[PDB]
Amino acid sequence: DSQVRQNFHRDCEAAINRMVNMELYASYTYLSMAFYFDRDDIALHNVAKFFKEQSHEEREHAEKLMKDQNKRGGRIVLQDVQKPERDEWGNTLEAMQAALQLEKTVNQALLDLPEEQVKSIKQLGDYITNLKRLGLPQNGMGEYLFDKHTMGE
Amino acid sequence: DSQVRQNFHRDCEAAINRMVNMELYASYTYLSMAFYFDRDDIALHNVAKFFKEQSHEEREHAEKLMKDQNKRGGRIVLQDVQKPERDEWGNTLEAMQAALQLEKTVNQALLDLPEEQVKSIKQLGDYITNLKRLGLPQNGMGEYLFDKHTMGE
Amino acid sequence: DSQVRQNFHRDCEAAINRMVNMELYASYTYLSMAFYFDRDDIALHNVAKFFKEQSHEEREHAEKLMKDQNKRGGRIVLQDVQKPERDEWGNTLEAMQAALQLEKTVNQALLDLPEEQVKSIKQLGDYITNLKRLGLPQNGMGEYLFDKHTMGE
Amino acid sequence: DSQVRQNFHRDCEAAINRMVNMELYASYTYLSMAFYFDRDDIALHNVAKFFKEQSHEEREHAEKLMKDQNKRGGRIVLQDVQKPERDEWGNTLEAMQAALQLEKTVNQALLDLPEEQVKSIKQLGDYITNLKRLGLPQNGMGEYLFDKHTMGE
Amino acid sequence: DSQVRQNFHRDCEAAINRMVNMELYASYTYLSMAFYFDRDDIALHNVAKFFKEQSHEEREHAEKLMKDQNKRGGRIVLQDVQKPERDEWGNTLEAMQAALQLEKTVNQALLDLPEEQVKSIKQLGDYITNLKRLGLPQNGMGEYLFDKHTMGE
Amino acid sequence: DSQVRQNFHRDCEAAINRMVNMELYASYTYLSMAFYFDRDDIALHNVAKFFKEQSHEEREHAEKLMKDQNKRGGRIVLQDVQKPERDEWGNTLEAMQAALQLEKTVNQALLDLPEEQVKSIKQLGDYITNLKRLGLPQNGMGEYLFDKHTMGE
Numbered sequence: 009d010s011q012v013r014q015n016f017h018r019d020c021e022a023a024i025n026r027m028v029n030m031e032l033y034a035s036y037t038y039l040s041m042a043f044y045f046d047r048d049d050i051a052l053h054n055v056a057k058f059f060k061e062q063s064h065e066e067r068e069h070a071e072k073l074m075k076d077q078n079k080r081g082g083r084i085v086l087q088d089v090q091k092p093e094r095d096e097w098g099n100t101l102e103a104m105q106a107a108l109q110l111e112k113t114v115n116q117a118l119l120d121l122p123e124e125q126v127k128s129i130k131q132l133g134d135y136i137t138n139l140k141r142l143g144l145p146q147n148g149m150g151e152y153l154f155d156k157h158t159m160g161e
Numbered sequence: 162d163s164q165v166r167q168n169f170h171r172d173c174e175a176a177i178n179r180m181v182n183m184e185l186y187a188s189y190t191y192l193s194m195a196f197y198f199d200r201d202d203i204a205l206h207n208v209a210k211f212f213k214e215q216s217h218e219e220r221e222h223a224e225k226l227m228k229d230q231n232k233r234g235g236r237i238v239l240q241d242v243q244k245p246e247r248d249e250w251g252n253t254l255e256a257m258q259a260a261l262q263l264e265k266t267v268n269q270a271l272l273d274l275p276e277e278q279v280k281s282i283k284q285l286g287d288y289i290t291n292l293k294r295l296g297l298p299q300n301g302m303g304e305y306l307f308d309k310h311t312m313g314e
Numbered sequence: 315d316s317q318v319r320q321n322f323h324r325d326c327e328a329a330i331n332r333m334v335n336m337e338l339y340a341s342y343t344y345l346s347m348a349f350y351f352d353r354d355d356i357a358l359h360n361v362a363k364f365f366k367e368q369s370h371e372e373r374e375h376a377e378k379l380m381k382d383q384n385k386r387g388g389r390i391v392l393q394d395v396q397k398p399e400r401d402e403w404g405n406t407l408e409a410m411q412a413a414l415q416l417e418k419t420v421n422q423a424l425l426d427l428p429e430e431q432v433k434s435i436k437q438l439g440d441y442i443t444n445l446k447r448l449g450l451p452q453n454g455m456g457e458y459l460f461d462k463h464t465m466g467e
Numbered sequence: 468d469s470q471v472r473q474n475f476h477r478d479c480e481a482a483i484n485r486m487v488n489m490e491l492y493a494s495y496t497y498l499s500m501a502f503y504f505d506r507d508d509i510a511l512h513n514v515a516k517f518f519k520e521q522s523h524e525e526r527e528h529a530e531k532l533m534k535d536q537n538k539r540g541g542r543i544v545l546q547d548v549q550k551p552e553r554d555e556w557g558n559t560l561e562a563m564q565a566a567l568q569l570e571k572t573v574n575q576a577l578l579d580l581p582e583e584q585v586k587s588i589k590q591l592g593d594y595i596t597n598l599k600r601l602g603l604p605q606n607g608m609g610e611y612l613f614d615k616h617t618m619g620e
Numbered sequence: 621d622s623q624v625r626q627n628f629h630r631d632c633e634a635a636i637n638r639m640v641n642m643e644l645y646a647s648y649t650y651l652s653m654a655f656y657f658d659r660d661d662i663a664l665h666n667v668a669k670f671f672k673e674q675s676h677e678e679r680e681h682a683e684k685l686m687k688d689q690n691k692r693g694g695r696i697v698l699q700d701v702q703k704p705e706r707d708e709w710g711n712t713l714e715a716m717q718a719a720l721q722l723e724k725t726v727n728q729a730l731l732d733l734p735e736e737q738v739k740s741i742k743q744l745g746d747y748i749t750n751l752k753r754l755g756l757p758q759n760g761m762g763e764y765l766f767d768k769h770t771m772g773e
Numbered sequence: 774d775s776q777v778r779q780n781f782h783r784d785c786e787a788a789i790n791r792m793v794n795m796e797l798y799a800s801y802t803y804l805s806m807a808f809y810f811d812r813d814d815i816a817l818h819n820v821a822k823f824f825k826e827q828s829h830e831e832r833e834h835a836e837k838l839m840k841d842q843n844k845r846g847g848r849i850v851l852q853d854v855q856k857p858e859r860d861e862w863g864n865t866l867e868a869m870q871a872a873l874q875l876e877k878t879v880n881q882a883l884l885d886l887p888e889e890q891v892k893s894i895k896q897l898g899d900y901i902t903n904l905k906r907l908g909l910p911q912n913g914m915g916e917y918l919f920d921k922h923t924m925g926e
């Protein structure tokens with residue numbers, strides 16, 4: 009047993025390892041979404057840019073948990089990072105609804121294990137409300153305008 | 162009777178107290194409107210930002226009247242600030258029409274008791290004309306565009 | 315039910331609404347105290363200036379709780395803001411003792427629901443100790459000196 | 468078939484997808500190495516810092532290939548990223564020998580599909596030569612000195 | 621009973637007083653270690669410099685708890701600060717192992733009563749691992765090199 | 774016997790150790806005084822601030838004597854630091870009279886073993902003369918004014 013380990017249950021150690029894999033999984037799904045909207049096919053580059061730094065944000069959380077695991081004297085055990093659920097993510101509304109479920113699954117896991125997770129979820133809810141207001145799925149002009157006016161900051 | 166009080170009728174003193182409560186009431190209604198448009202549900206953040214500084218503007222008028230009351234030797238008597246008329250304010254058009262009535266009620270009271278009240282009312286009339294041009298209530302794309310192009314300055 | 319709402323009890327939602335009204339109530343009482351010390355009658359302008367930004371501090375807490383309520387997917391329900399307990403607040407000692415009770419009532423509610431509430435309460439206790447040392451209620455020279463040397467920073 | 472696709476074989480498209488997964492695999496293995504040397508247990512923080520930006524460098528290559536795939540009109544197909552070979556990487560020499568094999572496997576794949584891959588491999592060969600000169604595996608003072616003088620820049 | 625005291629158990633008040641004495645005790649032990657390595661006899665001045673600001677860090681924690689005790693309306697009761705366990709602390713490894721036990725005893729007490737205590741303990745574990753790698757107790761060249769390369773920043 | 778020890782009597786070595794403990798004792802008593810005047814109860818924050826840097830000044834003297842002991846080849850032997858005489862220090866006059874006795878006891882010991890000790894003692898005599906002029910113990914307004922005008926620089 010580790011010399012810096014003091015009052016850190018084997019259960020917390022195993023839960024942090026599940027959270028690391030979950031965050032890497034979330035990062036991979038956002039990476040997949042980022043390059044889907046960059047397709048010539050799809051071409052909504054500010055939506056793509058949002059999913060790419062969301063991908064980076066989740067990879068950063070995973071590295072911070074790994075840091076925390078070593079700090080407390082736990083041992084990091086890595087698992088395969090499963091391929092994302094879909095290869096195509098439909099339109100901006102569909103993709104944002106899938107991202108909201110993903111952030112709620114990550115947040116659920118953190119509860120079972122924050123001021124930032126709730127910020128992220130409120131942001132995705134705001135986005136979904138505005139995409140429905142602009143008439144998605146059907147209104148392509150609405151989708152173009154969302155990428156320029158909301159995702160272009 | 163106050164040592165600085167000179168040519169200030171008991172009627173003007175009571176009217177200034179009614180105006181203080183009216184301005185606090187207007188501030189509370191705008192605060193209510195500000196946080197309604199911030200709902201994940203509604204999410205028109207520049208409309209929300211407009212109602213929040215309108216809320217601050219009315220609270221500032223109330224403090225200036227209280228300042229004026231003491232300056233003239235009157236005595237401030239505060240009353241309960243009634244809860245706003247509605248908890249939900251509908252859409253941007255509905256909310257702007259309710260704000261125009263509120264500014265006209267405040268302005269009516271000031272007449273019975275300015276270069277700024279008329280500016281505020283002309284501004285709300287301009288806003289309502291443009292929301293009707295954009296097709297509110299029905300046109301959600303119009304409402305999104307109003308929040309970006311007019312309320313985003 | 316709200317799309318961003320995840321693990322937020324109906325009880326926490328109702329308690330946050332009670333806290334919003336309590337903070338607006340505290341803000342109104344401090345506003346009342348601020349303009350009492352500004353009377354020609356009373357004229358302790360640094361005591362007045364302290365109660366006015368205390369009034370602003372409590373209104374800011376109420377807006378932050380409203381922000382938090384929307385973030386979590388709760389719905390803000392506003393109530394009347396009751397008129398302050400008194401129209402006259404006596405002398406600086408009397409007013410500071412009333413402010414200490416008010417901050418303890420707000421802090422009690424937050425317990426039932428901080429690093430800042432305890433700071434505020436220790437500050438009011440310090441003030442009351444020094445007003446008793448200067449001989450309040452009777453010693454008017456003490457009261458004048460407190461407004462200049464402690465409340466003038 | 469894609470409107471921007473011109474003279475891009477289905478074979479090149481499938482090979483770029485294998486290379487993306489290989490680069491993500493290399494990134495994950497370096498991440499694993501980075502946090503192994505950060506253990507209280509191991510504690511060679513400049514060796515850890517080297518493997519962490521190597522992890523970032525490989526993730527950047529994978530994103531650039533994905534960019535290239537969309538540019539040419541190919542379609543990105545992601546696969547699971549397999550867990551690294553080991554959970555423990557032994558000492559600095561063992562870890563550097565494992566990194567040299569990994570960079571040679573990546574470089575082999577790129578041949579089958581550069582001025583930077585050969586730079587990286589010559590760098591790892593230089594490191595291994597110096598670790599053998601310092602007496603690794605046995606000489607712990609040598610290993611400490613390598614982390615300070617070579618990996619500390 | 622104190623006028624600012626609200627929801628602060630007599631048990632928390634007595635525990636904070638035990639923690640103040642414990643932190644002063646830790647400060648005194650580090651002071652003792654600091655001047656041991658400054659002996660002409662021993663002369664590892666960067667190890668000495670580390671223990672002197674560790675001594676200052678623990679004295680600062682004790683003053684912050686005393687601040688917290690008055691803030692909450694508790695009353696500070698001081699006790700004798702016991703002389704450190706040893707007058708001689710052996711070599712750098714022996715001293716670092718004694719410091720790790722001391723930080724774990726302080727951290728245990730804080731549990732019974734943080735993001736900084738775990739940082740401090742991981743740092744001492746890292747140091748001990750590197751001193752064992754350099755061949756302490758026997759290898760004096762290793763000890764000299766540790767003082768220059770790790771403790772010299 | 775130490776290799777740098779030349780013409781340093783075993784008597785001077787033992788006296789320097791008594792002086793180190795005496796200075797740590799003086800530091801602890803001033804620390805106790807510093808946090809007494811910070812009580813909500815007492816609240817004379819510039820008197821508190823004076824005793825806190827006096828506490829730091831005595832701890833600095835103790836560290837300088839320890840430095841001198843090693844320089845000359847003596848060996849530092851630490852003793853328990855006794856708890857201060859009182860837990861409550863009364864009023865500012867009482868506390869200043871206790872500080873004057875403490876500085877005279879430290880200065881007596883230094884004689885038996887300066888341009889700074891006499892400065893410190895003349896300063897405390899000046900303070901006591903002015904507190905008696907302001908009517909301490911009875912005159913609380915005098916005590917408040919001393920904290921603002923003399924201790925506020």
Ligand SMILES: [Ca+2]
Binds near residue numbers: 090091547
């Ligand atoms: Ca799979």
Ligand SMILES: [Ca+2]
Binds near residue numbers: 243244394
């Ligand atoms: Ca009502």
Ligand SMILES: [Ca+2]
Binds near residue numbers: 241396397
């Ligand atoms: Ca009422």
Ligand SMILES: [Ca+2]
Binds near residue numbers: 550
């Ligand atoms: Ca596998």
Ligand SMILES: [Ca+2]
Binds near residue numbers: 853
């Ligand atoms: Ca003892």
Ligand SMILES: [Ca+2]
Binds near residue numbers: 700855856
């Ligand atoms: Ca004793």
